Paper text:
TcAPx-CcP has high sequence identity to members of the class I peroxidase family, notably ascorbate peroxidase (APX) and cytochrome c peroxidase (CcP), as well as a mitochondrial peroxidase from Leishmania major (LmP). Like LmP, TcAPx was later found to have both ascorbate and cytochrome c activity and was thus renamed as TcAPx-CcP. Integration of steady state kinetic experiments, molecular dynamic simulations, and bioinformatic analyses indicates that TcAPx-CcP preferentially oxidizes cytochrome c but is still competent for oxidization of ascorbate.
On the proximal side there is a typical peroxidase His217-Asp278-Trp233 proximal triad, as observed in yeast CcP and in soybean APX (sAPX, His163-Asp208-Trp179). EPR spectra taken at 4 K for TcAPx-CcP on reaction with H2O2 are consistent with the formation of a [Fe(IV)=O Trp•+] radical in compound I, with a concomitant reduction of the high spin iron heme, g = 6, signal. The radical was centered at g = 2 and showed a pronounced broad linewidth only present at the lowest temperatures with a narrower radical signal observed at 70 K (Fig. 3B(i)). Similar EPR spectra were reported for the exchange coupled porphyrin-tryptophanyl radical in LmP. This broadening was clearly absent in parallel experiments at 4 K on the W233F variant. There are two molecules in the asymmetric unit for both the wild type and mutant structures, each one exhibiting different electron density at the distal heme position, with one appearing to bind an oxygen molecule and another a water molecule approximately 2.3 Å above the iron (not shown). The low temperature EPR spectra support the formation of a reactive compound I intermediate with an exchange-coupled [Fe(IV)=O Trp233•+] radical.
Residue numbers in the entry: 55 to 328
């Protein structure tokens, strides 16, 4: 084990500023980068110890063409110019970093980030499909997926609270709309809106989704509203709705863990780079 501290081969403080500038020109890329890094880690099986998480294996087939990753080409493409500018960064480090920077940019927690991920060089390391969650399914499927990733219920609910930011796109997943009225803010408001609305069927979307009664401008997936139906998940979501600092600190710990599954030999930044 034992902590290793070392300056990375790239200029992390300049890289962070370049990412922030991308976000200031196009805030929609912030939630996109958070989803990108999550899908790159979401292939993990903590039992089989496979799926090539945190390795930018999503840059290869078949993983890049799995339905759960549709739209993430826009995320990969959006970082190619920073890859060229900082050529000593791995794609895996760049994706994960861009996600932690995005979260901090949207007013979210400052999430500790370590470097050293090594990029997949071919498709042979890609694990199979059906590792990413199915939005059309409910709480048992959610628990099955998050237990396979190595998370408990408190970490599962906190991670799903990332839908505080961003929105669904019909062209990517057949789902449409934001989860909150502040989609470029990172806070507990996915839980506030979840408890604070009556969810009804949206009759105008072919894939089954909900809308809020009050405005019809929010949406929830079946997997999202399954947090209300599971007694255990509901109790945990209420704690997060009630206490944004507790939600932010739970999300920070769980998202760092996510961006580190199936990794070795990671390095802490020198206090001044972090
Ligand atoms: C039950 C588990 C989850 C399911 C079923 C799920 C499903 C989805 C779907 C279907 C979208 C819409 C994607 C699109 O059309 O562009 C989405 C967006 C998003 N998801 Fe998830 N998700 C889950 C968990 C998570 C986790 C764990 C995170 C991160 C820790 C995450 C973060 C995001 C973000 C940030 C967006 C917005 C992307 C953007 O605005 O481009 N999700 N999710
Ligand atoms: Na992967
Ligand atoms: Na929000």
């Amino acid at each position: 084990g034992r902590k290793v501290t070392e300056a990375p081969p790239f200029d992390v403080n300049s890289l962070r500023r370049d990412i922030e500038e991308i976000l200031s020109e196009d805030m929609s890329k912030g939630p996109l980068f958070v989803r990108l890094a999550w899908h790159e880690a979401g292939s993990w099986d903590c039992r089989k110890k496979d799926g090539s998480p945190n390795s930018a294996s999503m840059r290869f087939h078949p993983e890049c063409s799995y339905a759960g990753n549709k739209g993430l080409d826009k995320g990969r493409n959006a970082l190619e110019s920073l890859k060229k500018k900082y050529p000593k960064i791995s794609y895996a480090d760049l994706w994960s970093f861009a996600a932690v920077v995005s979260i901090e940019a949207m007013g979210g927690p400052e999430i500790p980030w370590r470097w050293g991920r090594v990029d997949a060089k071919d498709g042979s390391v890609c694990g199979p499909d059906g590792r990413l969650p199915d939005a059309s399914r409910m709480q048992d499927h959610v628990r099955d997926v998050f237990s396979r990733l190595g998370f408990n219920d408190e970490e599962t609910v906190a991670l799903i609270g990332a839908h505080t930011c961003g929105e669904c796109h019909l062209e990517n997943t057949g789902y449409v709309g934001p989860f909150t009225h502040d989609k470029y803010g990172f806070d507990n408001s996915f839980f506030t809106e979840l408890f604070g609305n009556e969810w009804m069927l949206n009759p105008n979307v072919k894939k089954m989704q909900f809308m809020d009664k009050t405005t019809n401008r929010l949406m929830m997936l079946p997997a999202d509203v399954s947090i209300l139906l599971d007694d255990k998940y509901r109790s945990i979501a209420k704690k997060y709705a009630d206490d944004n600092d507790y939600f932010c600190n739970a999300f920070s710990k769980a998202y760092q863990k996510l961006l580190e599954v199936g990794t070795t030999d990671l390095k802490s930044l020198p206090a001044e780079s972090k």
